[PDB]
Design a protein around this ligand. Structure first.
Ligand code: RZS
Ligand code: RZS
Lengths: 412, 412
């Protein structure tokens, strides 16, 4: 038998807000976080908009000196992690610090820092590269700096599974707790790829929406006029905790994490199979891991990136898994509002899945004006839908065919 | 209920050879793979040598058409993975493809490709960034492309824990199999950080040996004249397999993976504590996981980076864990010959640990002319030492204070 894992703290930076409650208020109001990117000449680029974090104040978390040493993606991941640990009320002590670990990941890591140090290198040669370039740019430094700041001595690692990062990070942290390797994990992801290389690199793959005239309408999952994803920035962190540990200290418990599934499509480097066979296997694995029948699912936070092929694969995968129940559940893409936070997508969406359980409401898929051929599910078009939600899934289907599904259930 | 995990296939590119047996021949002969770097002009750099892979032929593995799209770190990870799968004798079928996954990690991933695309962006503009820039550079695409080529549909992920990556990748792949998420995993790491940004970045941190005039003597773990690590390139991959699965198909078993430990130092972004307290915690976790008396440990493949603080912290940790038995075991750093393969270090060193068991020989620590203060263990100075080895430990320690330990033992 395995131990039970619950969520006792959450933290976030998103295009909708500088914390969880601000972000969630935006989600339930159908607000878009997408706008023209500022303080950057994107004249030469095919996409000039995305989901920026607005008004982030790193000196709430770090000294100016420690912030200068760290890429924005690390700053964001530390902000969400500190928020999550504060929200949990956990007291770190000599008696528990060996039982508290971190798994905060990133899809792309420190592209901004790499770009600025390429400039130094090409213009002035190697002797002007910053001394803190390597440790301030590498993906495992959110887990590193968080563990140093809070004295965490448990499992310390970082996933990098592209757009699946935040989902895998939370799932694997849940395994650490369930199998007795930790009692508490801080888990999630962070991303800041809005630099020349990010907008330019996704742009060169023609993966991005180029709807520059109407950025708030660009991200339109399952809409027949969708033309690729919207790049966004931010972070999500959850405090995962063994159930008896949480009860013994009187923790507030948001929800229980009952299932985690993984699969590989083994199909294509960037596109999923048309029928979403891999995503279907992954959801089936997660439900098996939770000991739940597909009929018990009420709400799915889709991957829903606004790509032609990805959006239709998810509809096929949900029809396959859920059969006669596929229309009864509600499925929405909060990327319609947040855009695609890449490695942090699964983390902010796990938080939105937990809050859908707390508040008994399916967030909307905004901009779903004209559902595409076969997109006839309950996709919660336009407006939030209050409803019964006992069991909520959150899916991530990323580059490389790598799939993750989390299953959350109401706790009482 | 927890299943046993064995090693049935291994694969490698290192500075000593283009496969496992050629690399291992070099290890036992005390050969250095370190030389001045030829692939670029390093006259402006403070370090101009490293451990390059010599004469890699990607056309043993992939069409030149597909190779052209992939960072060297991906080509190296795929080559090592293909070697390991062939070495295992495993046949991928519809009956087992859902039960075979991959966890191949990297510390930095496609830095060369990032630098080359940054040069396009700065010199020409975003329109000259390669459409393959993202899928050909991001760390999870060894796992992604390997799954596409071989049809692996099991857990598909990638770790990035800096210099601990390969050890964490193998340990957490072993947990997938041990606890029933997979029956087979291909696990390890790959790295090719020898570009201007990499050599420049580690150079700016003053982390590298600057022994340009005698590169084969630069890597000198525990030697009083050491002056930092040597940067090296390559890959290690192992096929991990559930024991009954291996027995059922008549697999050749090299050794059993009995223990894995993780810990965080929670000390410093880059420096290990002088007492090795985090490394001691990690080794103790691994030995308890393996159900061992510490006196059963015969051979330790140290992290042994050739840094002043790293090498002495490892002696302190080994003396703390093993007490008087610390004088009976043999401990060596194969980085003395290979240099530091960063995210691939733990993968090639796990392979060297398995071969130490197969051949009953402790590899040497070359260049250990004058052991430093307190470096008075059996460090296998200069020459390979045949000896009884039932249990072998492989240690890794990385930036962010992240530690991993693998425990292997002979399989009867
Ligand atoms: C060291 C030679 N071993 C090899 C070569 C090619 C492949 C493939 N594919 C697998 N193993
Ligand atoms: C996250 C490392 N720990 C793990 C991994 C997988 C499983 C399973 N099943 C159990 N523990």
């Amino acid at each position: 038998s395995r131990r039970r894992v619950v969520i006792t703290g959450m933290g976030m930076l998103s295009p909708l807000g500088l914390d969880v409650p601000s972000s969630w208020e935006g989600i339930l109001a159908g607000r878009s976080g997408i706008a023209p990117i500022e303080h950057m000449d994107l004249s030469a680029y095919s996409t000039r908009f995305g989901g920026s974090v607005k008004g982030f104040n790193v000196e709430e978390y770090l000294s100016a000196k420690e912030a200068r040493k760290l890429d924005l993606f690390i700053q964001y991941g530390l902000a969400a992690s500190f928020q999550a640990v504060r929200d949990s009320g956990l007291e770190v002590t000599d008696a528990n610090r060996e039982r508290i670990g971190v798994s905060m990941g990133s899809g792309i890591g420190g592209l901004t820092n790499i770009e600025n140090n390429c400039r130094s290198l090409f213009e002035q040669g190697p002797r002007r590269i910053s001394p803190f370039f390597v440790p301030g740019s590498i993906i495992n430094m959110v887990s590193g700096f968080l563990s140093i700041h809070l004295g965490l001595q448990g499992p310390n690692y970082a996933l990098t599974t592209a757009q699946t990062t935040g989902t895998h990070s939370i799932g694997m942290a849940a395994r650490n707790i369930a199998y007795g390797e930790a009692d508490v994990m801080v888990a999630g992801g962070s991303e800041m790829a809005a630099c020349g290389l990010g907008l330019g690199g996704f742009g060169a793959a023609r993966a991005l929406s180029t709807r520059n005239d109407e950025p708030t309408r660009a991200s339109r999952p399952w809409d027949r006029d969708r033309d690729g994803f919207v790049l966004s920035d931010g972070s999500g962190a959850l405090v995962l905790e063994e159930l008896e540990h949480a009860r013994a200290r009187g923790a507030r418990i948001y929800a229980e994490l009952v299932g985690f599934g993984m699969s590989g499509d083994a199909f294509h480097m960037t596109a999923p199979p048309e029928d979403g066979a891999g995503a279907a296997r992954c959801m089936k694995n997660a439900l098996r891991d939770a000991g739940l029948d597909p009929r018990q699912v009420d709400y799915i936070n889709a991957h829903g990136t606004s790509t032609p092929a990805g959006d239709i694969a998810e509809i096929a995968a949900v029809k396959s898994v859920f059969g006669e129940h596929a229309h009864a559940l509600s499925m929405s893409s909060t990327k319609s509002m947040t855009g695609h936070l890449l490695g942090a997508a699964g983390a902010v969406e796990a938080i939105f899945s937990v809050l859908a359980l707390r508040d008994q409401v399916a967030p909307p898929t905004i901009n779903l004006d004209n559902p595409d051929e076969g997109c006839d599910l309950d996709l919660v078009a336009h407006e939030a839908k209050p409803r019964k939600i006992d069991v909520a899934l959150s899916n991530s289907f990323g580059f490389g065919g790598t799939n993750g599904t989390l299953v959350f259930r109401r706790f009482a």
